[PDB]
Design a protein around this nucleic acid. Structure first.
Ligand SMILES: [Mg+2]
Ligand SMILES: [Mg+2]
Length: 328
RNA sequence: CUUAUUAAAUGACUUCUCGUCAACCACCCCUGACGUUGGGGGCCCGGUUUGGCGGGGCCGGGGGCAACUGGCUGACCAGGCGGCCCGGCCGGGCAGGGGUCCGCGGGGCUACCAAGGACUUCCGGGUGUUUCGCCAGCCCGGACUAUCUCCGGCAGAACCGCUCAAUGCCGCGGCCGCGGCCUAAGCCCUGCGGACAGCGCCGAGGCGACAAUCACUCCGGGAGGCCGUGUAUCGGC
DNA sequence: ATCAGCTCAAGAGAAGTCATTTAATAAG
DNA sequence: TTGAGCTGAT
């Protein structure tokens, strides 16, 4: 196991051992820290030598989930898996339907204006902006704590003109130029063909393994089966839909969404909670209200653990946007 | 790299409307005290007529066992903002004057650096869970008309409403000698009648930050290399 | 008097037109 | 995807 180290100037250093991590914290020379992805690291409180060896990052994008791996010049140091749960198209469809009904029943007749709705600069649909921004944040937060010098990614391609079914390629092809533009600001980029990915996978023998095979290809590092495996997913909430849509008996509409409501906790926050004499660490599914004076907490995969008394919940970290999960 | 063809992804405007909830009126049915009056119900699902969607009229079945419906009004983010009015920037409010589409008609103009506006361009504003902050989308104002972006109609077409359905037809110029004259189904303005609204616009979308984040093994507070600035997988024994 | 376990319901669609980004191919 | 209702228990 290795602990990432970050210098007083904000550069990543080379990773150190857990023993050095312990003693640097104990002696007060460095502060322990967690990344936005929850990865533990240490920030120095002293200048130290800045010499580092090569480190490379690989990202193998999928539609539903991605593989990520980090390798030193010697070995793979990390494997990870990233989930993006495809929530935005339904949310935009429901918002569109509600807008259409609202305008129908609440506005006069209005002119149809569709001929000249020009778009200025580069454009992406909200779903593709969502997935690009998530993948960029993952990469950008990995490059924050590791001395990444090279980014490796497969350049997905599909012949849409000859096969109509290609949905799960379109969702990853679209937005690639913005991704590649943003990648090159972090580190030098090596694009990889799908055939090269296949060849390296078959040579060396969870899709983080495929991203690791792209590393073993480009940089020749050894495989590391003992490397830790992490699961990360973007947190999803009902951000502005404050109430349920259909009026129920006597015309009531129950409240639904909102990430903040003037309380202490907020839905993205990471918390430790007690219930039935047992301790849980999780993320705030639900907020206290005048009637429902409980905090809903969910596990790393987004399923609610339960509802908790607000006295028994301790705030660990405010919303990072991600959950995290180490796989034993 | 410009333009085009095919195919995916998912964003916008508009029309038509389902779905949910609530109140009142009219009619019908079961049942109760003695036609007056009182409790409750009058519901669903599938098929069909159309190019298609929603009403309506038919066909059939379920579930009740009681046969099986009309009219009309209000609500579906919380709220925010603009126009104008009344009282004294706070309180209350929608009278006036605006917005769009359709039918018939008129005035001025022009043939693509068009007619001359704006879903063009530039600047700015409203809205957009919030602890703070940013963005997408929509809408609006002023300044020009921006290094150029955009501007139509008929049939099919009906039991009704809407719709550029598949398809078919027209206009996107004509005439003369690059230039000139003329003229629209194109551009600007506008009259009378009808439709939507009852004063309008935006509200169910994406995200950043937060030090409360103190780890990993292993013993029973400590251990899990010393040095090259107490980083290092690189170098040194 | 309040903690914990278990349960419940939850808005959706046709059509006209238009617009980006990413393929494979044209033609310049 | 999340607030809220209901019950049993101490
Ligand atoms: Mg707000
Ligand atoms: Mg047609």
């Amino acid at each position: 196991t290795r602990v990432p180290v970050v210098g007083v100037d904000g550069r990543p250093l080379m990773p150190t051992t857990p023993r050095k991590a312990r003693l640097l914290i104990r002696d007060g020379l460095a502060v322990p820290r967690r990344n936005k992805l929850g990865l533990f690291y240490i920030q120095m409180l002293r200048p130290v030598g800045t010499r580092t060896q090569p480190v490379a990052l690989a990202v193998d994008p999928g539609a539903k989930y991605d593989g990520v791996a980090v390798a030193s010049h010697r070995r793979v140091e990390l494997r990870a898996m990233v989930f993006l749960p495809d929530d935005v198209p339904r949310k935009m469809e429901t918002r569109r339907n509600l807008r259409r009904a609202r305008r129908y029943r609440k506005t006069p007749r209005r002119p149809a204006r569709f001929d000249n709705r020009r778009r200025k600069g580069y454009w992406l649909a909200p779903t593709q902006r969502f997935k690009v921004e998530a993948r960029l944040k993952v990469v950008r937060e990995l490059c924050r704590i590791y001395p990444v010098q090279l980014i490796v990614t497969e350049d997905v391609r599909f012949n849409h003109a000859r096969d109509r079914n290609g949905k799960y390629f379109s969702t990853v092809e679209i937005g690639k130029t913005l991704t590649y533009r943003e990648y090159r600001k972090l580190a030098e980029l090596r694009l990889v063909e799908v055939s090269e990915t296949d060849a390296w996978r078959e040579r060396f023998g969870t899709h983080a393994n495929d991203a690791a095979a792209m590393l073993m290809g480009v940089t020749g590092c050894a495989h590391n089966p003992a490397a830790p495996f992490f699961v990360w997913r973007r947190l999803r909430y009902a951000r502005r839909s404050l109430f349920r849509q259909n009026p129920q008996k006597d015309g009531v509409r129950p409240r639904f969404g909102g990430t903040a409501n003037g309380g202490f906790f907020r839905k993205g926050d990471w918390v430790e909670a007690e219930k039935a004499g047992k301790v849980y660490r999780g993320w705030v599914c639900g907020l206290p209200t005048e009637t429902t004076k409980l905090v809903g907490v969910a596990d790393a995969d987004g399923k609610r653990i339960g509802q908790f008394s607000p006295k028994k919940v301790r705030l660990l970290a405010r919303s990072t946007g991600f959950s995290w999960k180490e796989v034993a």
